[PDB]
Design an enzyme around this catalytic site. Structure first.
Site, PDB file in Angstrom:
ATOM      1  N   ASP A   9       3.716   7.344   6.449  1.00 43.93           N
ATOM      2  CA  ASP A   9       2.646   6.017   6.005  1.00 43.93           C
ATOM      3  C   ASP A   9       3.218   4.783   5.709  1.00 43.93           C
ATOM      4  OD1 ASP A   9      -0.084   4.110   7.275  1.00 43.93           O
ATOM      5  OD2 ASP A   9       0.254   3.401   5.119  1.00 43.93           O
ATOM      6  N   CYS A  67      -5.608  -0.460  19.231  1.00 39.90           N
ATOM      7  CA  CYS A  67      -7.340  -1.351  19.377  1.00 39.90           C
ATOM      8  C   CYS A  67      -7.592  -2.391  19.703  1.00 39.90           C
ATOM      9  CB  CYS A  67      -7.716  -0.747  17.576  1.00 39.90           C
ATOM     10  SG  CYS A  67      -6.954  -1.660  15.968  1.00 39.90           S
ATOM     11  N   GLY A 111      -5.938   8.876   8.034  1.00 33.84           N
ATOM     12  CA  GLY A 111      -5.472  10.037   9.151  1.00 33.84           C
ATOM     13  C   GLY A 111      -7.080  10.269   9.490  1.00 33.84           C
ATOM     14  N   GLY A 112      -8.360   9.496  10.123  1.00 33.38           N
ATOM     15  CA  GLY A 112      -8.334   9.921  10.974  1.00 33.38           C
ATOM     16  C   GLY A 112      -8.013  10.583  12.226  1.00 33.38           C
ATOM     17  N   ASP A 159      -0.064   5.822  17.018  1.00 31.57           N
ATOM     18  CA  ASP A 159      -1.085   4.244  16.953  1.00 31.57           C
ATOM     19  C   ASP A 159      -0.799   3.166  16.418  1.00 31.57           C
ATOM     20  OD1 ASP A 159      -3.735   4.118  17.428  1.00 31.57           O
ATOM     21  OD2 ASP A 159      -4.857   4.910  15.364  1.00 31.57           O
TER      22      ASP A 159
HETATM   23  N1  LIG Z   1       7.157   0.934   9.724  1.00 33.52           N
HETATM   24  C1  LIG Z   1       5.516   1.300   9.592  1.00 33.52           C
HETATM   25  N2  LIG Z   1       5.207   2.716   9.471  1.00 33.52           N
HETATM   26  C2  LIG Z   1       4.456   3.742   9.297  1.00 33.52           C
HETATM   27  N3  LIG Z   1       3.094   3.148   9.121  1.00 33.52           N
HETATM   28  C3  LIG Z   1       3.156   2.041   9.516  1.00 33.52           C
HETATM   29  C4  LIG Z   1       3.880   0.874   9.047  1.00 33.52           C
HETATM   30  N4  LIG Z   1       2.942  -0.352   9.844  1.00 33.52           N
HETATM   31  C5  LIG Z   1       1.794  -0.043   9.450  1.00 33.52           C
HETATM   32  N5  LIG Z   1       1.691   1.586   9.522  1.00 33.52           N
HETATM   33  C6  LIG Z   1       0.281   2.069   8.943  1.00 33.52           C
HETATM   34  O1  LIG Z   1      -0.768   2.118  10.690  1.00 33.52           O
HETATM   35  C7  LIG Z   1      -1.602   1.882   9.727  1.00 33.52           C
HETATM   36  C8  LIG Z   1      -2.390   1.368  10.852  1.00 33.52           C
HETATM   37  C9  LIG Z   1      -4.179   2.079  10.572  1.00 33.52           C
HETATM   38  N6  LIG Z   1      -4.923   1.291  11.529  1.00 33.52           N
HETATM   39  C10 LIG Z   1      -3.634   3.516  11.186  1.00 33.52           C
HETATM   40  C11 LIG Z   1      -5.374   4.121  11.761  1.00 33.52           C
HETATM   41  C12 LIG Z   1      -5.073   5.740  11.796  1.00 33.52           C
HETATM   42  N7  LIG Z   1      -4.457   6.237  13.184  1.00 33.52           N
HETATM   43  C13 LIG Z   1      -6.448   6.410  12.284  1.00 33.52           C
HETATM   44  O2  LIG Z   1      -6.586   6.753  13.456  1.00 33.52           O
HETATM   45  O3  LIG Z   1      -7.138   6.927  10.771  1.00 33.52           O
HETATM   46  C14 LIG Z   1      -1.924   1.098   8.616  1.00 33.52           C
HETATM   47  O4  LIG Z   1      -2.191   2.158   7.814  1.00 33.52           O
HETATM   48  C15 LIG Z   1      -0.318   1.094   8.175  1.00 33.52           C
HETATM   49  O5  LIG Z   1      -0.169   1.930   6.570  1.00 33.52           O
END
Ligand SMILES: Nc1ncnc2c1ncn2[C@@H]1O[C@H](C[C@@H](N)CC[C@H](N)C(=O)O)[C@@H](O)[C@H]1O
Length: 461
Positions: free
Chosen positions: A265, A368, A245-246, A318
């Site tokens: 998530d 990323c 959650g950033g 994201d």
């Molecule tokens: N089908 C899915 N639906 C929703 N979330 C997902 C799915 N697959 C993976 N994720 C999540 O996507 C996230 C990717 C993260 N890097 C997101 C970082 C976030 N955008 C931030 O800036 O803090 C992971 O933590 C997963 O829990």
RNA sequence: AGGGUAUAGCUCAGGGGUAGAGCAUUUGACUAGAUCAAGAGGUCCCUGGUUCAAAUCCAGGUGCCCUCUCCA
């Protein structure tokens, strides 16, 4: 400079090579150039970003206040050194602190310790070694011994081992606060300090328990995304993949906590981390749910997810990615099938996002990674399958333009934001380089020498 | 057109037929352990398929994971 290229599987490296050496790039640059660009990238991915970027929680403290407090903090941590804290002109709520390294004159001690690759990458970014990170140590280690921390970049050290013949990477020296016994005797899942880094290769501030309500350690493009989305106070925003959650908390802060931010998530604990963050930073417009983003569109007949189509003002995808843009990433023991295993999921999440978007709404897709299949190709595919969507220019424009190969036009590529690790040479910053540094050089350094990232902006009709 | 993974208490190799390593733990010796020796340990996730025979190959099921700065 100091580290070699990122240790990739032959098949993976050849995959990425196929990516960066396509017909279009070869046409517009030549093989002799494109190949050197690729190799330069692979050389750069092993080294930390030259700037520690910190996002200020504007909903609890102003940038000025936080900057002053961080000046006092850096005064304390560095025993009275003199590193500046710049403020980005484009990203109003982002602070920049230069990284002093590498230091090649570190004398290696005999008492050794080995951490996980991820822990090592954390240490290079200015983190200490906490107990859950240590996966190996000299059996004669006592609490207080000046030890040399090495990074198991391959992740091949079996936990508890007293010797390791595999690949190690020197991270620097630090004062241990635990013996090898206390760590590996019995099975206490213990927490706390393990190794206080005193002489790291790269010198960056420790952001553990410092101003937790005011700060958020966040890569520059990541902080940029929430700005690009441009959420207005009172709107309805949704980021399908949110944890920890950033960008979520950032979006909430940009709206002055006035509106509705729905964060989803797949993993429970991660959602709990979202909630913990939101409660920590003081944002109340954040509502987190454990839910599959691909199945977030209402179909059956019953405020919780799933949601009705065209019910959100703005949507931030994201999407999960290979993470090839991660820095520092000194090694990646992934299968090619694993690296290319994200495009379908990203496309599903994308479809679900487009369905959930109001007309004249904004959809920001960000990764990323550096691959074409997860970036530009997904943009082309999106513009093809969904004709209602239309690529939009972004503000602020900081990163480079899109990479050729997806069949997009130059006009289309100029509207994308791709951050290239191989943009500028690696700056080996020392105090003498700090003193005689023009500010406009430092800012460009912060904007260019970053992690791999990709931002695309869409609008609906 | 999503993927990886499940094996000893922990961390992980292996592999169509008699179960493997490091650490932890237990015992004995030597001066609590930067010493030596010894053994204690697992229906190899559930189900079904192929097979003479599946812990191994295949399918489904389920749990955990796929960092987007710092208790790893
Ligand atoms: N089908 C899915 N639906 C929703 N979330 C997902 C799915 N697959 C993976 N994720 C999540 O996507 C996230 C990717 C993260 N890097 C997101 C970082 C976030 N955008 C931030 O800036 O803090 C992971 O933590 C997963 O829990």
């Amino acid at each position: 400079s100091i580290f070699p290229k990122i240790s990739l599987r032959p098949e993976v490296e050849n995959y990425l090579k196929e990516g960066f050496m396509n017909k279009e790039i070869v046409t517009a640059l030549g093989k002799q150039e494109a190949e050197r660009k690729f190799e330069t990238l692979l050389k750069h991915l092993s080294h930390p970003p030259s700037f520690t970027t910190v996002r200020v929680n504007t909903h609890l403290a102003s940038v000025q206040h936080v900057k002053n407090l961080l000046l006092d903090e850096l005064q304390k941590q560095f025993n009275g050194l003199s590193v500046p804290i710049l403020q980005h002109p484009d990203l109003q709520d982002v602070l920049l602190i230069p990284v002093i390294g590498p230091r090649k004159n570190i004398k290696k001690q005999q008492c050794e310790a080995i951490v996980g690759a991820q822990c090592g990458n954390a240490v290079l970014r200015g983190a200490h070694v906490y107990a859950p990170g240590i996966v190996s140590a000299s059996q004669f280690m006592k609490a207080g011994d000046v030890i040399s921390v090495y990074s198991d970049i391959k992740g091949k050290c079996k936990k508890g081992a007293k010797e390791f013949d595999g690949t190690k990477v020197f991270l620097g020296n630090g004062i241990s606060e635990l013996s090898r016994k206390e760590i590996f005797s019995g099975l206490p899942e213990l927490k706390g300090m393990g190794i206080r880094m005193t002489e790291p290769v790269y010198l960056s501030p420790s952001f553990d328990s410092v101003l937790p309500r005011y700060l958020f350690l966040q890569n520059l493009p990541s902080a940029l995304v929430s700005h690009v989305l441009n959420p207005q106070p009172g709107e309805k925003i949704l980021d399908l993949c949110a944890a920890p959650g950033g960008k979520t908390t950032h979006i909430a802060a940009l709206m002055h906590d006035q509106g509705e931010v729905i964060a989803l998530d797949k993993i429970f604990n991660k959602v709990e981390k979202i909630k913990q963050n939101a409660l920590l930073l003081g944002l109340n417009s954040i509502r987190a749910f454990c839910f599959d983003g691909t199945k977030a569109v209402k179909l059956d007949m019953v405020g919780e997810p799933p949601f009705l189509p065209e019910s959100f003002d703005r949507i931030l995808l994201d999407a999960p990615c290979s993470g090839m843009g991660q820095r520092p990433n000194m090694a990646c023991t992934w299968s090619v099938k694993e690296v290319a295993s994200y495009q379908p999921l990203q496309r599903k999440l994308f479809t679900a996002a487009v369905q959930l978007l109001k007309p004249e709404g904004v959809l920001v897709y960000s990764t990323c990674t550096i691959t074409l299949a997860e970036n530009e190709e997904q943009v082309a595919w999106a513009l093809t399958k969904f004709p209602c969507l239309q690529l939009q220019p972004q503000e602020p424009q900081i990163g480079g333009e899109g990479m050729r190969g997806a069949g997009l036009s130059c006009e289309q590529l100029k509207q994308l934001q791709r951050f290239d690790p191989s943009a500028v040479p690696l700056p080996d910053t020392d105090m003498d380089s700090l003193r005689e540094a023009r500010r406009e050089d430092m800012l460009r350094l912060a904007n260019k020498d970053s992690i791999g990232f990709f931002i695309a902006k869409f609008v609906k009709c």
